[PDB]
Amino acid sequence: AKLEITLKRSVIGRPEDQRVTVRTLGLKKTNQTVVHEDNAAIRGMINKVSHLVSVKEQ
Template sequence: MADKLKITLVKSTIGAIPKQRATVEALGLKKLNKTVELPDNGATRGMIQRVRHLVKVEEI
């Protein structure tokens, strides 16, 4: 398991359901192609799983 995850928003949330929009915002992503680094834990993995079609994830 990696120490941190690099998460990038690659698809717009315009057509997404409100719960998915809230999850993307909770991950700290506001604009398209922006990247955040978050700790690799169960909570983060769960949020990524909900919006996996909108984000790109790399282990660092």
């Protein structure tokens, strides 16, 4: 399942468990839209980052 991921809130000030999981999705600017296919791995990457990332169904 294709799945948009955007940054509604930046990376400054969050701890660096909440940066690498942001980084390993390729996110490197706010409101950058990197679309990976949905998977139980990647659904577990948005659990740790939920106050920061909006998912989107495709």
